[PDB]
Amino acid sequence: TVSHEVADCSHLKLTQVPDDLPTNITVLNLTHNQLRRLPAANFTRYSQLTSLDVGFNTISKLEPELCQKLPMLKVLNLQHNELSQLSDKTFAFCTNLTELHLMSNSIQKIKNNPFVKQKNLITLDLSHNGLSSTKLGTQVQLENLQELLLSNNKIQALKSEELDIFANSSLKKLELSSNQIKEFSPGCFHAIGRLFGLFLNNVQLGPSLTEKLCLELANTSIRNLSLSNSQLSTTSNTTFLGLKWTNLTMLDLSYNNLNVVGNDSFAWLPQLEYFFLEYNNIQHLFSHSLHGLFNVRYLNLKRSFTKQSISLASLPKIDDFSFQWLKCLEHLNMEDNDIPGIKSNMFTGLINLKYLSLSNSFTSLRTLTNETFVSLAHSPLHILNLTKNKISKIESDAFSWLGHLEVLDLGLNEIGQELTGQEWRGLENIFEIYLSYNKYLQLTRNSFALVPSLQRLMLRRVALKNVDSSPSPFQPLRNLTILDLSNNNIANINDDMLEGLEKLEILDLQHNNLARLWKHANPGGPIYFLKGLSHLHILNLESNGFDEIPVEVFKDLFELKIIDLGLNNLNTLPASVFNNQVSLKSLNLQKNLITSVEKKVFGPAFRNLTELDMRFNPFDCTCESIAWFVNWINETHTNIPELSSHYLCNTPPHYHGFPVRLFDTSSC
Amino acid sequence: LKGLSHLHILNLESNGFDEIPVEVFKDLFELKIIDLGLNNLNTLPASVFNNQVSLKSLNLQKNLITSVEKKVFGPAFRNLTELDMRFNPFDCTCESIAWFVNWINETHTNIPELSSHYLCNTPPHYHGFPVRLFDTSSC
Ligand SMILES: *[C@@H]1O[C@H](CO)[C@@H](O[C@@H]2O[C@H](CO)[C@@H](O)[C@H](O)[C@H]2NC(C)=O)[C@H](O)[C@H]1NC(C)=O
Ligand SMILES: *[C@@H]1O[C@H](CO)[C@@H](O[C@@H]2O[C@H](CO)[C@@H](O)[C@H](O)[C@H]2NC(C)=O)[C@H](O)[C@H]1NC(C)=O
Ligand SMILES: *[C@@H]1O[C@H](CO)[C@@H](O)[C@H](O)[C@H]1NC(C)=O
Ligand SMILES: *[C@@H]1O[C@H](CO)[C@@H](O)[C@H](O)[C@H]1NC(C)=O
Ligand SMILES: *[C@@H]1O[C@H](CO)[C@@H](O)[C@H](O)[C@H]1NC(C)=O
Ligand SMILES: *[C@@H]1O[C@H](CO)[C@@H](O)[C@H](O)[C@H]1NC(C)=O
Ligand SMILES: *[C@@H]1O[C@H](CO)[C@@H](O)[C@H](O)[C@H]1NC(C)=O
Ligand SMILES: *[C@@H]1O[C@H](CO)[C@@H](O)[C@H](O)[C@H]1NC(C)=O
Ligand SMILES: *[C@@H]1O[C@H](CO)[C@@H](O)[C@H](O)[C@H]1NC(C)=O
Secondary structure, eight states: OOBSSEEEOTTSOOSSOOSOSOTTOOEEEOOSSOOOOOOGGGGSSOOOOSEEEOOSSOOOOOOTHHHHSOTTOOEEEOOSOOOOOOOTTTTSSOTTOSEEEOTTSOOOOOOSOTTSSOOSOOEEEOOSSOOOSOOOOSSOOOTTOOEEEOOSSOOOOBOTGGGGGGTTOEESEEEOTTOOOOOBOTTTTTSSSEEOEEEOTTOOOHHHHHHHHHHHHTTSOOOEEEOTTSOOOEEOTTTTSGGGGSOOOEEEOTTSOOOEEOTTTTTTOTTOOEEEOOSOOBOEEOTTTTTTOTTOOEEEOTTOBOOOOTTTOOOOEEOTTSSTTOTTOOEEEOOSOOBOOOOTTTTTTOTTOOEEEOTTOBSSOOEEOTTTTGGGTTSOOOEEEOTTSOOOEEOTTTTTTOSSOOEEEOOSSOOEEEOOSGGGTTOSSOOEEEOOSOSEEEOOTTTTTTOTTOOEEEOTTSOOBOTTOSSOTTTTOTTOOEEEOOSSOOOOOOTTTTTTOTTOOEEEOOSSOOTGGGOTTSTTSOOOTTTTOTTOOEEEOOSSOOOOOOTTSSTTOSSOOEEEOTTSOOOOOOTTSSTTOTTOOEEEOTTSOOOOOOHHHHTTTTSSOSEEEOOSOOEEOSTTTTHHHHHHHHSOOSBOTTHHHHOBEEESTTTTTOBSTTOOOTTO | OTTOTTOOEEEOOSSOOOOOOTTSSTTOSSOOEEEOTTSOOOOOOTTSSTTOTTOOEEEOTTSOOOOOOHHHHTTTTSSOSEEEOOSOOEEOSTTTTHHHHHHHHSOOSBOTTHHHHOBEEESTTTTTOBSTTOOOTTO
């Protein structure tokens, strides 16, 4: 039971409260134990506890005197117990409680007044009980209560009198989810002084009972309303009529299997700002279906439409100008849908749209022509996501309508083509382009000549072709900072591929075939493609088949901090190859063929490191191979994980399998 | 491989083997050709080729073998015609290849590309040097 300021006793098999703890302990966690009871005498020593989490135990009942020994108790958690009965004296002395959690206690009913005495209580949780009513008292108490959780009970109706005890309470959260409520008596929500949030998830209401509830919620202070999985199959223009008399800001209608939304179904919500409609079954979206929602800023439509059906091929249909009402919309999410395509006025009217996600939103979007995004011309779009749409071809001026765009994600598609460079015309403010995991991309001289402001370019797993053009395709990218070219099986690179890219910081080249370029027998000499990269910080050259490293390939990389060279075939390294790496913090050389670690090579590299990774190597445990290295290991602050297990000698056979760190250098 | 008394040719090349159980070849008395190249073999148990009294061709190229010792290769190297252990990281030390280099010095078995592809790997003093040029006068 480790404890310095908070005491935790989780899964300690404790049957009684330990009596050997610091006196000044304020938090005592006793969850998942076998505490049968909580006698006050065992808590006499602890007179300064603030939070006592005793849930998930076998407490059947408590005593009022327990709160006498804890005058400063604030949070009391009795989750998952069997306190089926409560008394008016049970919580009388606990006058400073803020949170009282009584979930899953098999409480059947509340008799007279178990919560009258406490006045500073903020949240009361009574979920997963057997309660059949909201009756918690007779007089008016719980003045400062803000959250009332009553989920997963047996409550079947709401009555005004049952809630009358909350006349002076401003309920910020009223959770009634998973209770089969079938009747909302008039004035039931007007009993609460101020109700700000109501949750009715997993409560089978239906359109008619929804209309009754909305009429019952009128002229209240409600701001958040959640009706997820409420069996709301259809909506009409009279469904939320009562909500005309409130200032609702958030509405949740997800998982309702909603099929048809009538025109002006939400015209009663002029102040709505957050709308959630994910995971529904909408067949057709009409022009006036979203009419009257001009204050909405966030709309979620993920998985909101009917899926592909092989019986009738009834793809969901979105009428044109169906979003023209959303003048203040800024964030639109439409992922995981089966929309056939993008029409000429799909997004017309969205004059404040800044984020649009269309990841996996379409079934047949193969070609991105110059008319695809014309409806987004007047939107100030900054981020566009188009992943997983099986896009195959991008034509010229495809994104010419997006002049303010900064992030464009086109990965996880089937784009196989040659980048002529005309696809990026009009992208005057672009910063990031993601193209990883496509069919094949072939570069040319002017592939990126039209986007000089680019800063991040990801080209992983695209089977890059012609990256070795005599004028480098990356030459115009003077502001480029992150470049990813991994897993492309690239074999040939010219020495001026990265010339002029003084701002480059991250370069990923792992899982290519660049081994031949660094061999001294390569015709014309080794290729020095890392020159001039003064600001480079992260270099990844893992799994390229390298056998040898030219001595002067890292000479210009003064600010380099992380270099990864594992999974290569490196055995012998030239001396003074890491001389200029004066700021190196992480070196990775695992799963190579390295046998000796010597000062003339690794001296400057091992100067001030944080992490070292040279695990699966055939170390030759000899006084001229690892003596300096093992002495360095003996005294060093660099973190070397799995040092005692995966750093094993290979030769001589006397040392085969022995740990490198246990090599004895006393006779060197 | 048990019970195969009349087996003559065995090919186990490129199976990813790391270790060989000591008693896998015990019943193969008439075995003449065994191919174990392109595996990941480094350490072999002693007396693993004891019963191969008629072995004529042994192939162990492109493995991870570092030491060739009498307790393993003694009976195997008795009367051979061909030996193939070319691309291996030989540890040129007096306890790793001294018996092997002495055996190479006087033997009638044909060892092609002995002077070029049998190169030391460790210690770094010997890295790249031919195995056959190892000096055992100070062993
Ligand atoms: C007391 O400790 C328990 C166990 O660590 C906390 O209960 C849950 O523990 C699981 C497993 O670590 C977490 O996944 C949950 O998130 C924890 N519950 C919550 C609500 O976060 C318990 O919360 C701790 N109690 C206090 C007062 O810190
Ligand atoms: C575009 O949307 C996709 C899908 O929602 C995002 O992909 C997720 O990215 C996060 C963070 O990288 C990962 O943890 C998830 O696993 C990804 N999901 C899938 C299905 O791959 C992607 O990040 C978005 N792109 C941008 C630029 O926001
Ligand atoms: C608390 O409720 C009582 C009874 O309705 C009322 O008289 C009193 O003014 C309320 N307190 C406040 C601060 O409104
Ligand atoms: C809300 O109050 C207004 C103004 O008093 C009233 O006209 C309307 O009928 C009320 N709504 C309901 C559902 O009673
Ligand atoms: C209302 O909903 C929004 C969005 O889900 C949330 O951020 C906010 O906290 C909610 N209001 C209250 C009072 O909890
Ligand atoms: C709802 O729409 C119908 C169909 O046009 C219309 O007759 C009715 O008046 C509308 N309801 C309200 C409350 O306006
Ligand atoms: C109203 O809805 C019906 C069917 O839901 C649709 O045919 C009609 O066009 C809609 N009204 C307008 C003005 O679009
Ligand atoms: C799109 O390209 C076609 C073919 O070049 C051209 O005829 C058409 O005018 C272009 N569209 C726009 C809006 O420029
Ligand atoms: C590159 O960044 C610098 C500094 O922010 C800026 O002056 C320059 O305009 C940028 N280049 C382009 C083409 O946006």
